[PDB]
Structures are given as C-alpha cells and as structure tokens.
PDB file of C-alpha atoms and ligand atoms in Angstrom:
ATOM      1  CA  UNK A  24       2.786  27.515  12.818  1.00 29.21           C
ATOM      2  CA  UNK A  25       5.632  26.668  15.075  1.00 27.53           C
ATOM      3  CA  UNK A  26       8.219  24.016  13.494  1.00 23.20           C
ATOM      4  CA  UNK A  27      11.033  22.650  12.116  1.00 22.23           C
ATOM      5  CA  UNK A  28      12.154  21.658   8.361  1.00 20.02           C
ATOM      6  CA  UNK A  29      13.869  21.809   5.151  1.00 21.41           C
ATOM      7  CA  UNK A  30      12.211  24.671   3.350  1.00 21.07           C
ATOM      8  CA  UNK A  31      12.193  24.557  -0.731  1.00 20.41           C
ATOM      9  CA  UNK A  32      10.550  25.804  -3.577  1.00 21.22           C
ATOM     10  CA  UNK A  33       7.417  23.605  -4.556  1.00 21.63           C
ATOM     11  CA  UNK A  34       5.896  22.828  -7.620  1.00 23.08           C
ATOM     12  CA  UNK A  35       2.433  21.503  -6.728  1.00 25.95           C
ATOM     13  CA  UNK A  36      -0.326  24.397  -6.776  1.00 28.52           C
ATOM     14  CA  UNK A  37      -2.217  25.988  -4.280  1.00 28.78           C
ATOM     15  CA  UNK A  38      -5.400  27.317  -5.400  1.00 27.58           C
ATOM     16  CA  UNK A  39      -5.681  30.961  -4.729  1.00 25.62           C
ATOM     17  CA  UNK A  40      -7.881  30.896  -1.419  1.00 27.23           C
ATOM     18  CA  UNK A  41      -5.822  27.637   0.045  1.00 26.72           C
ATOM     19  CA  UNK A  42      -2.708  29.286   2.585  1.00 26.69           C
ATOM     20  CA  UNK A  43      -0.876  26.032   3.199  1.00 29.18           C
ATOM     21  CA  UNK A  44      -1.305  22.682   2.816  1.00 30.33           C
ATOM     22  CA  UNK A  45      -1.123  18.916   5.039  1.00 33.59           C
ATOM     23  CA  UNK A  46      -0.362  15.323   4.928  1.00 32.93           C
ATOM     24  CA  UNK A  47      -2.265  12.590   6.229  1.00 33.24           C
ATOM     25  CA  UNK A  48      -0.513  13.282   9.632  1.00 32.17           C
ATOM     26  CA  UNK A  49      -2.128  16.165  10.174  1.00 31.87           C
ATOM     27  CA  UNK A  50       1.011  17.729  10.102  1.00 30.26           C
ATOM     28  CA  UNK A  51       1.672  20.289   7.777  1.00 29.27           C
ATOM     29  CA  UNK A  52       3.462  19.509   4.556  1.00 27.30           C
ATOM     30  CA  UNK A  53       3.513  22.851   2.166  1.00 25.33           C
ATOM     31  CA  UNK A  54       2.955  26.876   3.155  1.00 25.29           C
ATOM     32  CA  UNK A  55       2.580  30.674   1.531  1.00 24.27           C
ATOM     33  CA  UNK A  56       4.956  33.065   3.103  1.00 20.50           C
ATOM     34  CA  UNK A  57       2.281  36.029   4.013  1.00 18.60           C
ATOM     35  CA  UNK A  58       4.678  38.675   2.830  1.00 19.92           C
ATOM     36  CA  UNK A  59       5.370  37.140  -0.999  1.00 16.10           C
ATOM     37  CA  UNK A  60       2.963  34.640  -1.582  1.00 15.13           C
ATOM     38  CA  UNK A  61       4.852  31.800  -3.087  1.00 15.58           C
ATOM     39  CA  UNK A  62       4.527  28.584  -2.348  1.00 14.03           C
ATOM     40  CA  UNK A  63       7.283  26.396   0.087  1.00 12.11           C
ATOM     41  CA  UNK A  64       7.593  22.653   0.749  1.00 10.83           C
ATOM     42  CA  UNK A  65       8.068  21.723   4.332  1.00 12.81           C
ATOM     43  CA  UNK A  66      10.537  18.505   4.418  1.00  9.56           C
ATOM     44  CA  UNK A  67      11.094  16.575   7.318  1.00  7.27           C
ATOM     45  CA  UNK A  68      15.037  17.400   8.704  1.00 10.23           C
ATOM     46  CA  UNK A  69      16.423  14.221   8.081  1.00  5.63           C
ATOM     47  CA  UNK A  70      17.399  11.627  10.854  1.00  5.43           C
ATOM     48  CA  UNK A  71      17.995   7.911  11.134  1.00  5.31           C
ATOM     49  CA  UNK A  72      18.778   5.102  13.470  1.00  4.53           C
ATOM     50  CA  UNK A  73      22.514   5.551  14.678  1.00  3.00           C
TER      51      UNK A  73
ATOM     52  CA  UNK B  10     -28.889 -18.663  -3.722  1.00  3.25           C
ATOM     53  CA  UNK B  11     -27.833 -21.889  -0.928  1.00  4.40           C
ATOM     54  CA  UNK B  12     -24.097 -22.747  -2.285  1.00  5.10           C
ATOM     55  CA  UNK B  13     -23.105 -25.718  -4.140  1.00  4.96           C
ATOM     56  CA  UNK B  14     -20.806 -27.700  -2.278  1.00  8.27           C
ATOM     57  CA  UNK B  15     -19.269 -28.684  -6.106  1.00  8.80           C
ATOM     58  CA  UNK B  16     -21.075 -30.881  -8.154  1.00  8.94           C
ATOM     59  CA  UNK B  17     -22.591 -34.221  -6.846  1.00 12.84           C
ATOM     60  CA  UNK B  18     -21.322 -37.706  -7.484  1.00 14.94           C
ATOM     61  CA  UNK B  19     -22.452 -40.856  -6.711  1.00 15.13           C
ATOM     62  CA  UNK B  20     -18.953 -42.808  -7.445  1.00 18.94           C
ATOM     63  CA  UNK B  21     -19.389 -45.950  -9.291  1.00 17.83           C
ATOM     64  CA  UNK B  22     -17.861 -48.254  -6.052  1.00 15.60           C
ATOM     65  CA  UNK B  23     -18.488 -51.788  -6.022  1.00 18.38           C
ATOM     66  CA  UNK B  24     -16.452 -55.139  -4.315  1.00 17.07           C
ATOM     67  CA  UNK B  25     -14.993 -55.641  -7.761  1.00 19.05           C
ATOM     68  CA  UNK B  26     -14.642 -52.382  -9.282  1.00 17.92           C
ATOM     69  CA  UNK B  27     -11.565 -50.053  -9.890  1.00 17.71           C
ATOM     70  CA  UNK B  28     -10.984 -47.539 -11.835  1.00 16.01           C
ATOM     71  CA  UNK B  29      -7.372 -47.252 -13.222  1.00 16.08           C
ATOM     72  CA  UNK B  30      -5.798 -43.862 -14.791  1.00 15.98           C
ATOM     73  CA  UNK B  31      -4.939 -44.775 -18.624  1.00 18.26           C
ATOM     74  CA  UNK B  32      -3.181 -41.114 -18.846  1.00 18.36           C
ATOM     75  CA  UNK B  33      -1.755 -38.477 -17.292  1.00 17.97           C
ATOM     76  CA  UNK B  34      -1.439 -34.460 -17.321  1.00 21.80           C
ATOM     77  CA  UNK B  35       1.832 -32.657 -15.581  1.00 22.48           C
ATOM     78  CA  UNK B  36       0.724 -29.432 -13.805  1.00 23.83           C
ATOM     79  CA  UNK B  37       2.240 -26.679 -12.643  1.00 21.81           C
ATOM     80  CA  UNK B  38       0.332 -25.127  -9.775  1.00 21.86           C
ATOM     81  CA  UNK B  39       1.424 -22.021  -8.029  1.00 21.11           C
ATOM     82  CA  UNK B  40       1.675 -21.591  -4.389  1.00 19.53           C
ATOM     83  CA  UNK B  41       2.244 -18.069  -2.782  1.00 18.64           C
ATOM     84  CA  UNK B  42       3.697 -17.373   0.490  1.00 19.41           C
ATOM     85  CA  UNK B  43       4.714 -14.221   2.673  1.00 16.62           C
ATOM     86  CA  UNK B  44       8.242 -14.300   3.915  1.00 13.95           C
ATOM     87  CA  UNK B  45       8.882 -11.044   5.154  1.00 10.39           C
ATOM     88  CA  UNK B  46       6.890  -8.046   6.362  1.00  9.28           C
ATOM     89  CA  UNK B  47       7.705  -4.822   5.903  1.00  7.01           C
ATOM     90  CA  UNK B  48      11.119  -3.990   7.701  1.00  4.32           C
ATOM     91  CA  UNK B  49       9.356  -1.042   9.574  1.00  5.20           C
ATOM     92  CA  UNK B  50      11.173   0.430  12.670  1.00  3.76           C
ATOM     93  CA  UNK B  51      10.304   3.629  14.428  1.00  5.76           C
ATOM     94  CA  UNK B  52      11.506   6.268  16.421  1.00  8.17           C
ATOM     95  CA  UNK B  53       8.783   6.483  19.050  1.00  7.80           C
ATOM     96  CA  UNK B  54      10.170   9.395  20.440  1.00  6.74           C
ATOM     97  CA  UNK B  55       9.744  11.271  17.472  1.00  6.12           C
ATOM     98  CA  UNK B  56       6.579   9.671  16.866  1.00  7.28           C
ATOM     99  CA  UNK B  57       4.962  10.654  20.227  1.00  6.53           C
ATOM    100  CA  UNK B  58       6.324  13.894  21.174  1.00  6.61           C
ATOM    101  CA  UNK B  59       7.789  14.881  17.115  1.00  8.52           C
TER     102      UNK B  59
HETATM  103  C1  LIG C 107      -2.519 -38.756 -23.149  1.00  8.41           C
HETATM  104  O1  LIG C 107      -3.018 -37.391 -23.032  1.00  8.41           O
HETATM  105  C2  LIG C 107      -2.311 -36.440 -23.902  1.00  8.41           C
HETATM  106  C3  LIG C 107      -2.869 -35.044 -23.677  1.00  8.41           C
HETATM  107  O2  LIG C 107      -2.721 -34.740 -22.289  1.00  8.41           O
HETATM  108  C4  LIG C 107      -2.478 -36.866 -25.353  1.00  8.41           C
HETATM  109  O3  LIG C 107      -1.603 -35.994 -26.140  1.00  8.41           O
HETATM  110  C5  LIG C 107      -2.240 -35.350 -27.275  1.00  8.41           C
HETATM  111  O4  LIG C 107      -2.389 -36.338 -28.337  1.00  8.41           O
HETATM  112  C6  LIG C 107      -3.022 -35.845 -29.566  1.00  8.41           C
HETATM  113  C7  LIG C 107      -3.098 -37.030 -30.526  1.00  8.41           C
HETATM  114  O5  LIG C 107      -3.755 -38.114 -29.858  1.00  8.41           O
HETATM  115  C8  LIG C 107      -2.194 -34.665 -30.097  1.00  8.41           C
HETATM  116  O6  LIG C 107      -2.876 -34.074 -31.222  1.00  8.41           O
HETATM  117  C9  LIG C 107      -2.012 -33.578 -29.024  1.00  8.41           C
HETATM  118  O7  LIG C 107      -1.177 -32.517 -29.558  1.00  8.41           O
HETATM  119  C10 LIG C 107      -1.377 -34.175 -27.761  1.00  8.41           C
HETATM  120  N1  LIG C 107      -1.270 -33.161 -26.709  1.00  8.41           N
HETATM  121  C11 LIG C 107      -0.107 -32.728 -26.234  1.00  8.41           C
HETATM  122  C12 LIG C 107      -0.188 -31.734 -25.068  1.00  8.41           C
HETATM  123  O8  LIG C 107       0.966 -33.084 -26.711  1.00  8.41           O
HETATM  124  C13 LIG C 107      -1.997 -38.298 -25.555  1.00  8.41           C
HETATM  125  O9  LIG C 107      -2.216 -38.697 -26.925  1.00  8.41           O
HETATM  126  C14 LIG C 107      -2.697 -39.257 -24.594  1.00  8.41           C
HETATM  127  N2  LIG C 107      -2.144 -40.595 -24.758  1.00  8.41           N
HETATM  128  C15 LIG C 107      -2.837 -41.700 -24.531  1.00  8.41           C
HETATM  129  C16 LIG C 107      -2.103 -43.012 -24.822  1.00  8.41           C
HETATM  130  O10 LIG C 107      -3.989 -41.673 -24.101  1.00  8.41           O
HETATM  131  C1  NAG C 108       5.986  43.568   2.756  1.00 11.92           C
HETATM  132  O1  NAG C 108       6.758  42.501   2.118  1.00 11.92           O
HETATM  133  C2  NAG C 108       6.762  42.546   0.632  1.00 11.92           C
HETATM  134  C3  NAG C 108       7.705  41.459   0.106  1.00 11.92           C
HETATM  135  O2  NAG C 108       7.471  40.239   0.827  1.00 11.92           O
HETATM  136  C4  NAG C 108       7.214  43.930   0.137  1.00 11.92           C
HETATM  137  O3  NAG C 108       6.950  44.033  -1.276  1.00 11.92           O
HETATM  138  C5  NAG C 108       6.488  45.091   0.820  1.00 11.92           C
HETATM  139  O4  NAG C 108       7.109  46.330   0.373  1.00 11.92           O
HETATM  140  C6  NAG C 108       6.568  44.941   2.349  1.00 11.92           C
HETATM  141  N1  NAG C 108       5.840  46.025   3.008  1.00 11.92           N
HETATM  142  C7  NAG C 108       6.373  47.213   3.256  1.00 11.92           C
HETATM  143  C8  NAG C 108       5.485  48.215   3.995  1.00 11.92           C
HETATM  144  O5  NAG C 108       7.511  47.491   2.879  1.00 11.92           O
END
C-alpha cells in the first residue's frame, strides 16, 4: 500500500482478523504495521487553495 | 383510494348575495427558502489523479 499521510495513533478498533481499514473513497483510512500490530490512522497531508 | 381534491362546496352565490367577514384571525405562516448551497470547491487535480 503505496501512499502518502499523517500517520497517528488511533483509537477505533480493529477486530483481530481485520489488517487495515477504508473510507467511503475506497481509499484507505487506518492500517496494522505487520511487524507490531498496532493500529495507525492514515490522515490526509493537509493542503488548501492558495 | 382516488384522492380528494379537498372537500366539496357548492358556494351559496346568488345576484344578491354576499357574504361579509364579521371577524378576523392574524396568522403567522412560515415560508422556507434556500439561499446558499454548500460553498464546495475542489481540487480536481487531486481529485483525479490524488
Ligand atoms: C373575534 O374572534 C376572536 C377569536 O379569534 C374572539 O376572541 C375570543 O373571545 C372570547 C370571548 O368571546 C375569549 O374567551 C377568547 O379568549 C378570545 N380569544 C382570543 C385569542 O383572545 C373575539 O371575541 C371575536 N370577536 C367578535 C366581535 O366576533
Ligand atoms: C520483528 O519486529 C518485531 C517488532 O516489530 C520484533 O519484536 C522482532 O524481534 C522482529 N524480528 C526479528 C527476527 O528480530
């Protein structure tokens, strides 16, 4: 899963089979790290109309 | 069922017939109107090729 983001620590929970997580978009929203398998938001990097 | 189109009446016309209000009731009847949509802009760019 190629991308780019703010990564944080989440607080929603994935059930134990689920490895990451989407919005509407399609586009992912939330992932495990496969080494230690805690859970990380992916934010959007942020950006606005100069 | 086939719709009423409101109640029926036959109104009580003649050539020397009025009827004239003895009273009166104020009302206060709303009326709702849109004004503005949404403010939405987007980056198309972003939104096309993210
Ligand atoms: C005109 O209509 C109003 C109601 O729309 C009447 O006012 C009421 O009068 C009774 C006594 O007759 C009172 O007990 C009510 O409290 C009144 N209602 C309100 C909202 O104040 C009024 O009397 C009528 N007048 C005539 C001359 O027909
Ligand atoms: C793999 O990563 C985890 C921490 O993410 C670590 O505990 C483990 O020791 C690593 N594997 C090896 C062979 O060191």
């Amino acid at each position: 899963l190629t991308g780019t983001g703010v990564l944080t620590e989440s607080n929603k929970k994935f059930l134990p089979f689920q490895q990451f997580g989407r919005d509407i978009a399609d586009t992912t929203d939330a992932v495990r790290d496969p080494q230690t398998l805690e859970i990380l938001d992916i934010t959007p990097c942020s950006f606005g109309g100069v | 069922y086939t719709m009423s189109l409101g109640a029926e009446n036959s109104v009580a016309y003649s050539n020397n017939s009025i009827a004239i209000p003895t009273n009166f009731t104020i009302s206060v009847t709303t009326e709702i109107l849109p004004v503005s949509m949404t403010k939405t802009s987007v980056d198309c760019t972003m939104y096309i090729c993210g």
